Design a binder for this molecule. Structure first.
Ligand code: HEM
Ligand code: HEM
Ligand code: HEM
Ligand code: HEM
Ligand SMILES: [Cl-]
Ligand SMILES: [Cl-]
Ligand SMILES: [Cl-]
Ligand SMILES: [Cl-]
Ligand SMILES: [Cl-]
Ligand SMILES: [Cl-]
Lengths: 309, 308, 308, 308, 309, 308
């Protein structure tokens, strides 16, 4: 979907930029924000057209509090702030954000330049509260050393999982995206053997093969994020996580970003991860990963995004 | 769309070939030309399949006069010859062309080879009247130094803008294309400051950012090529312009090519460019660019092309 | 089109892996085979996702006889074992095969790794009877030195030619695939002149141009594999042939693979090739190429494959 | 030069990592740091070998103070700490750093990974004092929008400019490097016209062509960084500058890094930049750029590095 | 040899530009020309640095008449105008040229931009008399359909063949380059069978294999351009020919360019091609190829080029 | 470094072809072999030149015994047939081979085509006894899942380790190469834990980091293949190992190839591996890998090879 905003279905990229901003309180601030996001195709082409391949994309997400400031009477069915979770030792905090820009390209400069134009257009009307520069790490691995994104649905299944349909016609083609910036305890994770790490995740480390049924822990990342309803129907999300870090501050991170037609699915995966199935049987990845942020956004389709204001 | 003729919606390429031809007067010339263009998928695949990536595309256009020679019975709603324009300072001539081949690939050799095969097959039945070898120039710029193509519609908008639909269902999937070969007066262009050039185009130069509303001159290229109907709906065209030139003949050019499901959109941009809006307030780009050609073609869909 | 099994319509790749297997007569064997192939998206993603470009693909084919062991209640309209041919000079053997894995990627390692994992997951439940490592050879050529695959249908044409439609609705989106592992007599082919070789194939060698109608032998590979029915309508297959070989065993092969919504088209092609049209007037390609295998498979759509 | 430490003459890369560290006071810290930097080819190959292309490079610099702790006996002729400069308007501070790792690759992940391994291995024996992740910006530009590196010497000139030779034969193959992290005042820079910016730099912006002699201001960046001795011989440095930034902290930067067989050349450029030539006639680039750091390191050859 | 002028030894490229110019008669004209060519590293880096790969190169050649206008007292041993040849049916004309720029890059825009800057710097001081935009054609083929450049010497042998040595110390590292723009009669060549074409050339068409000794005509392109002196020592040249053409004017061409430490070798190859060995036994490639130009230039080393003026 | 035979110092490639041949006992056979290998630059250029990047390379090795048939008068100091080994558990067989063709390129087709032409030109004069198609496997790994080739010497180090120097001046620029076609016991290797596998090799698996001195087994592949002499001086080989395999025959191999200025280094390595150091303390890699071949060749410099 060459240089069109709200391309939720783009395949993974070598570079990404995640920007989370909070909008100013004023009416001027609300109008500027609208002007910028509803015309986001402008900066997108202004930057992206300069690369022959046209790899640049930009998905705009809008938070529930900000949505109600600008579209009080028409609201997608499931738009609400991120639901925080507190387990006994691990928590998913709910942190501020009115705007998400999830920007991807084959090159860093393209992501940076678009972020630069976007921030410049907003000026005093919004403030950056989180900024993460994602990068591909070897053969699609995360900093834990496992291939990250394998079972993502693709093509038609990606459309089915991620994009609003007949259930909420007024917002068909939109999505719900959740972000969490995770920081890893690399030391503690390195004290585990590969075989233990594989039990935490649910897949072999180097070869990225799913552990067979009878060796697959009930509390593995894979088991707990498998969602089958009563009718036996599987429910998937579309993820685009990326490595990030700072060697001097000792930050080694995974930026989780996940898209769903109904955030209930993502919310339940999180509930299973943090609170367990059965209760207390939680995701051990969280012994090595601590979420510093948690924000939910509505991803309007292009048509709805262009109308804002 | 891999190796299919009439792929109007292909993205930009590193290389392109623009071939404009006039057909012979004889009934035999007509039949040769029709045999070649109707089976154009042959040469297209014969050359194109040789590249793993399959970047080669070929769009065939037919002029109004030639169309009448081969399909006197049914005509696309808007097919007519290019309309010359005489402005207060500059003019867009209408020049001959029965056939357009708009060829694009990742490599010069594929364009050249497809051109070679096509010309060879047409033999004496046609004559090359204009030929330009277009090339990507740095980060999608033209020789004026500005990023050229930025606001092209893409994907669905591109299809809505360029392809014939329900309004002329007999020729669904076709398009209308207009070409003009422009030559620039480079030294005159260089006497302008960058800011002056920016005001002429409507966008910042290096950074390719549209001037804000209150800094946008009323006669800027962008302003005059903005087409908004009475219901407030914008109407866009799809452009595939490329740089070309010859250093010995001091030729520095932009080959303009624009596709639209209704050429009146393109034509109205041209009128607003050459005559001005309001009249007299014409596009300053034309102070540094002179069109040496001007031709309109109908772009039949594959089905229609294949039956000519 | 990324990392989805049963993607028949994928473009040419630089590397290929063709695996043909026979299943165990057992019931655990039938079950292991079913678990592996119905969840083929697993290993495909497990390998493919490691490559940024996501070039890896995998079409699974099921032989007629093994299909019956696994879905007796329901069967595609035209599934059957490969019809062997015995003609004037040359013969097409019908050889054994229950499972086909047609694997393609931009890299060899991705092909091999996927293969490794499919083989490991089947364990004792199945046996490899034919393994071919296909490779791109220069500008899309076969080892006979001709560009191989040129007139393949593409895009919508390719879908219409290869994919089961309204005529068999329970299996919509599936296909029928025929493989044949050909080996060439290189020294004998090399005693031909280029012009003789062109006569055999139907196209010029370097330039890959189809011979003129008046110069085109009635027994050239091209004429014999051209299918026009009684209404004047053409019928096409989608092929993904690849070179392969071993230098010390002096094997130089074309691994033929072709997909159709209906095997009757491929089978007619094969008849015209081996039997001749008129009879005795057979495909001279067959004088320099000997089919060492011959097998038909049904390619289930992704839905049909996942429930099995 | 594939995967060899101290490859000063590597061409520009898409990505780089600049790590500046201070070592611990203890004798044990000294020994750990020396063990790590002397065996730096280990991590370099451990990461670098994983990329087919082998683009990864790593240049280790050592500060004057730390050098004295480990090789009290022999010193490179010109090793001393960075000299602060106080100009009439702007100043270049001298900031701490015992170790420099200048890491370059085609991919961020290789830089980051090499950095990770190096920091891990140094443990408590050192602290990261500055870290910047540099990146190529369009067609070799810096964030001021100018092509940055144009006149770098290359090949033999590069080796003559950057590498220690007969003048200090004990440290042949070494170099001296100076780093300064500059932050820009982007909005101030943008109040200038393109022509003004061109006069500040000494080159046209889009086209990267040096201003002719009579249009070149006496205080242009290019003019002040031209070093010609009394015999008329120019003395050049080798720069590997990269863009960096943070959009949230409104940081837009150029990380300057310059290698020379004699840092007095670099230092004299700095003096002429910060104090002016004649005094007071300083580099206007410094009106829009502020150096947050300033540090000098000796770059030992592989032999010397390996014996530390 | 990244972005350095006079890089004679560069491997073949996807695009090339050959520019041949004649210098104006005046002293101002001579000085401008000198200023431009002696500072040619300026435009080279100005353009070439913008491509990360640094593929751009520029070799400057100077004709004998122009050399004597500017360096009257120091002259390379073998610098003279191109020696014309007239066979009974085919001739190698000697055509004007004081300056050659042989420019190569991985992209057209880079060649074009450098040519543009070079021509701009010369203004009225010189006139373009020939301009050819070369391009790679498939797998290193020429428009005759044969792989063109196969037997070129490489690495050390390339240096030995192409570059002035101890024989002429004052100009060590310089070269002598000859150009001829050939246009083909494609029709007449297409009337030959592949096997005949192979006999003309000396190599198989598709596979590019040298014809064995006993099937190799005495008048093949390969036989006639094989140069063995009396001592049995082989003498090679370094060629960088490229396809070019214009579909509308029906031009299909090969731009021959060949470098040698002593143009005597190139001259003898030409003499053999045009006049035959034995006499009359000429190169049949010339039945299908007609030279429209013929010019010889001296290629100074970087040091000598920088000194001019 | 382009298209010159006997280029030992070439970096890793995506594809590989290893050909080992035995010569005919005849005199025509000896002569045909000599014509083909002394003019090996012919076919190398014939194939290589077709690829813009010029990645194709070809090292020719001559076995000790065939060398004697062809240049009895003159012999390299350390030429001899492969010394076989019989150790506590595992044995390295000395197998037949007169000619080695070590071929590398960015593409398979280039490898195969070069091979095809070398084989065709030798005809009946020689016979292929071992053919291996090597491939790059993910991030420079072998099929044991470890990064293979990491500590290879590079640039000047690589030249000093691999190329005959002042110590044998008549053969300066030549090398000695040992090949061994290893096959792996995959299921047995997979019963090991990652940490056990790391103990066997000497390096961490995913991260490819060399184990700390205190954690490093005395029988790890790394320690056993580390050569330090009595003066404290290290001696290294240059390896170009590649993966290879066949799925249906369940072969999963590492094709070992190593070059040295002196085979004594490689031979010591092989002794420490098979016999153990102290004796019995052998390379555990050998528990999961079995050498199916074992052959030494002299790699003549280009001069020496061309006169033969
Ligand atoms: C530190 C943060 C995380 C890390 C390192 C991580 C890592 C991984 C890895 C290595 C896999 C296996 C390959 C694959 O993607 O299929 C995986 C799977 C998955 N993860 Fe995460 N993940 C993280 C956070 C999350 C969160 C917060 C969620 C849910 C909101 C989530 C949902 C999933 C899902 C749905 C799968 C696919 C499971 C399946 O059906 O096989 N992940 N993750
Ligand atoms: C000398 C020939 C021309 C040059 C050098 C030129 C250059 C440019 C440039 C630099 C832009 C801004 C970037 C972009 O959005 O593409 C532009 C925009 C545009 N031009 Fe042209 N142009 C030329 C002729 C024409 C002609 C003849 C037409 C109409 C027939 C045309 C129609 C347009 C349109 C529709 C836009 C997009 C306006 C918008 O909606 O923002 N151009 N052109
Ligand atoms: C804010 C930091 C700086 C910026 C943005 C900057 C930018 C530039 C630009 C655009 C050029 C022209 C292109 C080129 O030839 O590279 C240039 C040239 C140059 N700069 Fe800088 N520069 C910076 C700092 C420095 C410093 C600190 C030094 C010396 C220590 C320096 C030394 C040079 C030199 C030697 C040249 C080439 C001059 C010539 O011979 O033409 N620069 N710089
Ligand atoms: C229409 C013009 C020409 C064409 C089409 C042409 C074509 C070819 C071809 C296809 C080859 C075989 C591959 C190879 O390069 O090794 C070749 C070889 C060669 N050509 Fe040309 N050539 C042309 C002009 C010239 C001229 C004018 C000269 C001499 C001044 C020349 C000198 C050579 C040489 C030295 C070889 C290598 C012979 C050997 O040692 O094998 N060529 N040429
Ligand atoms: Cl960024
Ligand atoms: Cl062209
Ligand atoms: Cl494979
Ligand atoms: Cl980094
Ligand atoms: Cl050009
Ligand atoms: Cl091979």
């Amino acid at each position: 979907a060459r240089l069109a905003p709200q391309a939720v279905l783009t395949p993974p990229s070598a570079a990404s930029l995640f920007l989370v901003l909070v909008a100013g309180d004023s009416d001027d601030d609300r109008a500027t924000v609208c002007d910028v996001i509803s015309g986001i195709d402008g900066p997108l082409k202004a930057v992206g057209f300069r690369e022959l391949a046209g790899s640049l994309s930009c998905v705009v997400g809008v938070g529930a509090q900000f949505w109600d400031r600008v579209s009080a009477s028409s609201k997608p069915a499931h738009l609400h702030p991120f639901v925080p979770l507190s387990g006994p030792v691990h928590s998913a905090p709910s942190t501020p954000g009115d705007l998400l820009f999830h920007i991807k390209a084959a090159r860093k400069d393209l992501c940076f330049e678009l972020g630069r134009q976007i921030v410049s257009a907003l000026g005093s009307a919004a403030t950056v509260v989180d900024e993460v520069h994602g990068f591909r790490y070897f053969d699609s691995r995360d900093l834990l050393g496992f291939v990250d994104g394998t079972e993502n649905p693709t093509d038609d299944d990606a459309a089915d999982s991620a994009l609003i349909g007949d259930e909420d016609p007024d917002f068909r083609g939109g999505s719900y995206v959740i972000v969490q910036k995770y920081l890893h305890d690399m030391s503690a994770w390195n004290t585990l053997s590969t075989e233990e790490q594989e039990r935490v995740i649910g897949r072999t480390k180097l070869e990225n093969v799913e552990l067979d049924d009878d060796a697959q822990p009930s509390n593995s990342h894979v088991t707990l994020n498998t969602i089958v309803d009563d009718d036996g129907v599987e429910h998937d999300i579309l993820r685009d996580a990326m490595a990030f870090g700072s060697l001097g501050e000792a930050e080694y991170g995974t930026y989780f970003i996940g898209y769903a037609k109904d955030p209930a699915v993502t919310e339940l995966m999180l509930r299973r991860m943090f609170l367990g199935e059965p209760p207390g049987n939680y995701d051990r990845v969280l012994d090595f990963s601590t979420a510093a942020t948690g924000t939910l956004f509505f991803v309007p389709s292009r048509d709805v995004l262009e109308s804002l204001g």
